Amino acid sequence: QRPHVAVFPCAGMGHLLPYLRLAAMLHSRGCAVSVISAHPTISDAESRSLSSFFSLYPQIRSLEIQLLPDPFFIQRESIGNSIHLLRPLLASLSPPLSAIFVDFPVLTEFSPIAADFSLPTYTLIVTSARFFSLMAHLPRLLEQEDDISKKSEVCVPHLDPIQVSSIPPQMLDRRHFFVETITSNVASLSYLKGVLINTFTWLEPEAVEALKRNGVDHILPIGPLEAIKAEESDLPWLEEQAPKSVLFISFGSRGAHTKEQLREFAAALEKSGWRFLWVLKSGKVDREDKEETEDILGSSFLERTKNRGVVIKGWADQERILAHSAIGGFVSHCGWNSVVEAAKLGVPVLAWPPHGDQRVNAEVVEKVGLGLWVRGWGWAGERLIGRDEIAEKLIELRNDERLRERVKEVREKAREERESGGISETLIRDLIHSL
Amino acid sequence: QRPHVAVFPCAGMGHLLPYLRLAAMLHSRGCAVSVISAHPTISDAESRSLSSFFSLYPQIRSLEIQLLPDPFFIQRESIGNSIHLLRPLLASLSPPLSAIFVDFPVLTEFSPIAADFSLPTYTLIVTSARFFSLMAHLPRLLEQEDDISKKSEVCVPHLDPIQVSSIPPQMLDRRHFFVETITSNVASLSYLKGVLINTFTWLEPEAVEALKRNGVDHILPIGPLEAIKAEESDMDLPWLEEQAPKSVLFISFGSRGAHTKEQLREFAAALEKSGWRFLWVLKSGKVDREDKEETEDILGSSFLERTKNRGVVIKGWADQERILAHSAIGGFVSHCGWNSVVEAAKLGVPVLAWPPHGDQRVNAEVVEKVGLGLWVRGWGWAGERLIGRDEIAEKLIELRNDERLRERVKEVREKAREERESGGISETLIRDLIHSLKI
Ligand SMILES: O=c1ccn([C@@H]2O[C@H](COP(=O)(O)OP(=O)(O)O[C@H]3O[C@H](CO)[C@@H](O)[C@H](O)[C@H]3O)[C@@H](O)[C@H]2O)c(=O)[nH]1
Ligand SMILES: O=c1ccn([C@@H]2O[C@H](COP(=O)(O)OP(=O)(O)O[C@H]3O[C@H](CO)[C@@H](O)[C@H](O)[C@H]3O)[C@@H](O)[C@H]2O)c(=O)[nH]1
Numbered sequence: 001q002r003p004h005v006a007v008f009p010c011a012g013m014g015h016l017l018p019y020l021r022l023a024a025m026l027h028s029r030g031c032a033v034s035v036i037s038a039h040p041t042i043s044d045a046e047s048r049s050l051s052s053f054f055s056l057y058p059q060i061r062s063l064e065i066q067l068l069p070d071p072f073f074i075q076r077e078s079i080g081n082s083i084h085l086l087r088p089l090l091a092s093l094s095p096p097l098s099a100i101f102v103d104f105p106v107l108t109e110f111s112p113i114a115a116d117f118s119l120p121t122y123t124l125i126v127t128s129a130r131f132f133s134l135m136a137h138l139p140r141l142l143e144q145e146d147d148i149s150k151k152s153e154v155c156v157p158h159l160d161p162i163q164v165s166s167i168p169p170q171m172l173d174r175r176h177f178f179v180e181t182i183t184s185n186v187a188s189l190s191y192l193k194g195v196l197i198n199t200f201t202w203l204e205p206e207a208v209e210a211l212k213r214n215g216v217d218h219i220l221p222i223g224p225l226e227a228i229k230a231e232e233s234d235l236p237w238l239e240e241q242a243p244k245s246v247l248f249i250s251f252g253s254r255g256a257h258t259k260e261q262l263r264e265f266a267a268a269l270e271k272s273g274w275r276f277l278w279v280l281k282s283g284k285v286d287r288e289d290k291e292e293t294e295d296i297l298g299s300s301f302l303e304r305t306k307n308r309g310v311v312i313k314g315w316a317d318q319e320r321i322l323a324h325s326a327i328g329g330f331v332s333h334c335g336w337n338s339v340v341e342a343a344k345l346g347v348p349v350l351a352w353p354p355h356g357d358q359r360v361n362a363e364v365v366e367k368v369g370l371g372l373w374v375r376g377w378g379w380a381g382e383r384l385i386g387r388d389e390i391a392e393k394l395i396e397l398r399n400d401e402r403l404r405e406r407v408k409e410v411r412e413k414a415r416e417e418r419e420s421g422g423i424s425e426t427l428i429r430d431l432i433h434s435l
Numbered sequence: 436q437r438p439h440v441a442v443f444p445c446a447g448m449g450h451l452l453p454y455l456r457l458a459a460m461l462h463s464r465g466c467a468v469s470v471i472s473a474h475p476t477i478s479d480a481e482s483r484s485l486s487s488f489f490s491l492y493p494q495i496r497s498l499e500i501q502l503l504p505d506p507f508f509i510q511r512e513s514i515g516n517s518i519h520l521l522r523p524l525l526a527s528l529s530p531p532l533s534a535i536f537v538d539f540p541v542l543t544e545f546s547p548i549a550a551d552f553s554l555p556t557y558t559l560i561v562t563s564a565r566f567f568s569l570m571a572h573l574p575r576l577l578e579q580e581d582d583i584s585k586k587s588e589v590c591v592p593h594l595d596p597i598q599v600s601s602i603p604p605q606m607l608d609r610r611h612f613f614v615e616t617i618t619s620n621v622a623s624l625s626y627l628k629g630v631l632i633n634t635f636t637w638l639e640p641e642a643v644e645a646l647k648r649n650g651v652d653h654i655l656p657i658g659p660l661e662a663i664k665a666e667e668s669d670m671d672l673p674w675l676e677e678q679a680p681k682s683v684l685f686i687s688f689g690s691r692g693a694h695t696k697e698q699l700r701e702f703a704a705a706l707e708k709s710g711w712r713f714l715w716v717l718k719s720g721k722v723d724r725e726d727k728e729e730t731e732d733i734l735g736s737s738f739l740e741r742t743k744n745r746g747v748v749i750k751g752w753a754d755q756e757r758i759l760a761h762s763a764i765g766g767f768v769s770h771c772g773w774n775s776v777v778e779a780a781k782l783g784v785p786v787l788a789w790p791p792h793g794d795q796r797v798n799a800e801v802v803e804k805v806g807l808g809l810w811v812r813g814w815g816w817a818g819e820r821l822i823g824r825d826e827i828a829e830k831l832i833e834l835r836n837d838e839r840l841r842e843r844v845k846e847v848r849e850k851a852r853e854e855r856e857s858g859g860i861s862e863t864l865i866r867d868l869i870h871s872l873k874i
Contacts, residue, residue: 058494236760240762287857
């Protein structure tokens with residue numbers, strides 16, 4: 001017999017994928033896994049990825065909740081309201097779960113269910129240790145009035161200061177619901193058996209140690225998460241390119257920028273001379289609402305770059321593309337999942353964080369030597385950054401010998417961690433044993 | 436929970452694989468899938484593919500119908516005869532199918548079964564939109580008094596006129612069953628929820644609009660279909676790995692054999708003349724692998740010896756989609772069956788078109804419009820006239836040297852890539868059908 005565990009992401013591709021990856025890592029290491037999904041999904045992509053995952057992993061079981069009656073936050077509240085639907089589902093499981101992994105946002109709401117069933121519950125953090133360090137200190141931080149206006153930096157104990165320019169404004173307003181969501185779930189970490197984070201110690205040593213010293217001693221640096229597998233099968237344009245010559249661009253699972261800004265970047269691509277594969281979601285937040293068809297970049301750019309660039313509109317297999325030998329650079333939005341994959345695959349990064357914790361994730365990218373970053377660009381829409389400025393960075397990414405060498409080291413280190421003797425691997429095996 | 440759907444192909448690799456591809460496509464996308472096959476299969480390959488497919492996809496399920504005791508056509512007739520055998524099978528099935536996809540030929544014969552079962556039914560059309568418009572217009576066309584052979588062209592409504600030389604004589608002749616098959620099924624096209632075609636709008640914008648106008652507004656352009664999972668043998672791989680990129684010509688004249696030995700020899704001589712490196716997949720053919728006793732009594736020893744350095748000839752079946760995908764492949768000499776054209780368009784391989792039978796000549800007309808391939812219309816149906824080595828050799832040289840073609844094929848590939856994107860019509864249409872297909 002082998003232990004049964006369930007994994008439960010609330011919303012977003014950024015949350016969902018790591019959990020699907022965690023579930024596959026658990027299945028590979030000897031556990032029976034159930035993935036719990038809340039329906040209907042806000043986007044086609046999470047729903048499509050869930051269907052795709054189940055076909056790829058027949059052994060993993062699908063548990064679904066139908067939800068009773070800005071969008072991702074609303075979905076988080078929908079799950080919190082409908083969290084009681086999990087109770088009949090957990091009791092029904094053929095072999096009971098010895099563990100469940102639930103998303104950080106629903107830990108408070110799920111706290112009673114964990115108590116009634118006496119079920120050990122852990123959590124997988126999808127953001128950086130440094131941003132998570134700030135999240136844990138937020139309640140103590142909000143006790144003092146010192147972050148309201150005259151604050152250049154916030155000092156989280158045991159790590160160097162976080163400048164206030166990299167902290168999302170909603171996090172610093174007590175009235176805002178975002179603070180309430182973080183403040184409740186942070187208290188809810190006390191009942192967890194462990195808190196899994198998708199980072200490793202040598203990538204973030206001060207931050208991992210800062211969490212342990214600041215009230216999170218069950219933190220487990222389990223990163224990087226392994227790739228979801230796929231049946232082997234655009235390879236051809238990529239296949240036809242010389243190694244290290246192609247720059248991959250993604251601004252996330254959602255659109256980041258204004259058309260004028262994107263066009264400013266695009267001109268920059270041309271000036272740089274990089275061959276590129278670019279994945280564009282100019283649909284803002286939802287797959288379903290995105291109906292634009294390269295109306296964002298204009299026809300002339302496609303005509304001019306037709307030989308040396310491919311623009312994929314919508315979803316792409318980003319991790320799999322990153323793996324390809326042709327790729328030589330990544331222009332990332334600095335979401336922790338993408339940043340970690342760049343670290344894993346040793347791809348040099350030009351960091352362009354637009355919203356949320358991505359500015360702090362960019363700080364980590366710069367600190368480890370994984371990529372180049374300009375703090376002055378700021379949050380999306382604050383400033384217009386011109387072709388000439390962007391191009392200079394693109395040209396640097398190409399030419400920085402040191403960066404390429406440092407990136408290789410990040411990759412070596414990332415590899416060591418998922419090896420048998422590795423800390424991340426040791427820690428997961430240690431947890432599975434705890435059964 | 437998942438919708439349970441079934442895919443039913445009747446006969447021939449050209450039909451079977453596309454259904455197998457659709458079935459796999461449905462499975463990745465949240466469907467519980469069964470494949471219905473008729474036994475005994477006409478060819479070994481058909482049998483080989485089915486058995487292999489199930490091993491590759493354990494989750495997909497096999498439903499077999501045992502059959503009471505030209506061949507491919509005969510087999511289809513047999514299937515229509517044994518069509519009742521389904522009724523126990525559909526009844527047997529748990530969970531019940533949300534929808535079923537059945538091949539174009541037996542649409543009428545399955546019509547009763549669909550109605551009784553109150554089961555929504557679909558077709559996958561394995562031919563081009565351009566040929567299909569001709570098939571949907573055929574019933575009206577026969578009604579037209581002037582017999583088709585006398586007229587130089589036939590005008591389908593809203594379509595570029597189709598030249599009669601491009602239309603198989605069997606289609607224009609009333610006595611022939613083939614006419615009875617096309618006309619019957621077309622009429623059964625009204626009971627279906629949708630008709631799915633392995634093409635996309637860019638590839639054929641006029642033909643798809645015409646189908647919508649001409650009484651098939653439930654057509655869905657679902658192309659190109661996705662590639663099936665593979666065995667990945669490390670045996671037919673080595674010569675291809677050795678060669679430089681884009682320097683190898685791949686030749687395949689179909690699932691089945693196409694041409695006379697004299698004709699094949701004409702082409703084989705031409706091939707030496709071009710100077711292309713090549714991979715030729717050869718089949719004696721007629722219709723059946725089982726009956727193909729002869730091996731390289733078609734080409735002779737001398738040719739093989741001379742070209743040994745730069746050529747490989749494979750006799751029998753090969754995994755063509757995998758080969759075309761290879762870095763080494765630089766051109767495709769094709770019979771222009773639709774499944775093959777799409778793979779070339781989808782994979783961006785330049786085509787010299789040589790269609791010998793059936794809708795293949797119409798398909799070649801599409802390859803030409805698209806800029807995917809080079810075609811000579813004058814060559815005619817297979818066996819009509821011998822085409823000389825020099826004439827073939829000239830076309831082969833052009834394939835090598837045409838820079839512009841290279842540009843267009845690349846453009847064709849991009850267009851294919853787009854249809855496979857998440858927001859693309861082919862994906863949207865398919866996802867929508869699966870969503871709507873709940874109950
Ligand atoms: O076209 C795409 C785009 C993304 N991905 C996958 O999506 C993940 C990327 O997610 P991430 O890099 O984390 O970005 P987001 O999902 O946009 O970010 C959300 O989650 C991040 C990690 O928590 C946070 O840092 C952000 O604030 C939050 O908005 C990667 O693993 C990719 O493989 C694709 O597969 N294809
Ligand atoms: O060695 C081989 C030979 C064929 N194939 C595959 O088999 C299929 C063949 O399809 P197609 O190119 O359309 O050939 P046919 O099966 O001969 O096509 C028949 O069916 C088509 C669709 O109705 C018609 O357009 C044609 O005229 C008719 O001959 C494709 O998947 C090929 O890649 C292989 O994988 N390996």
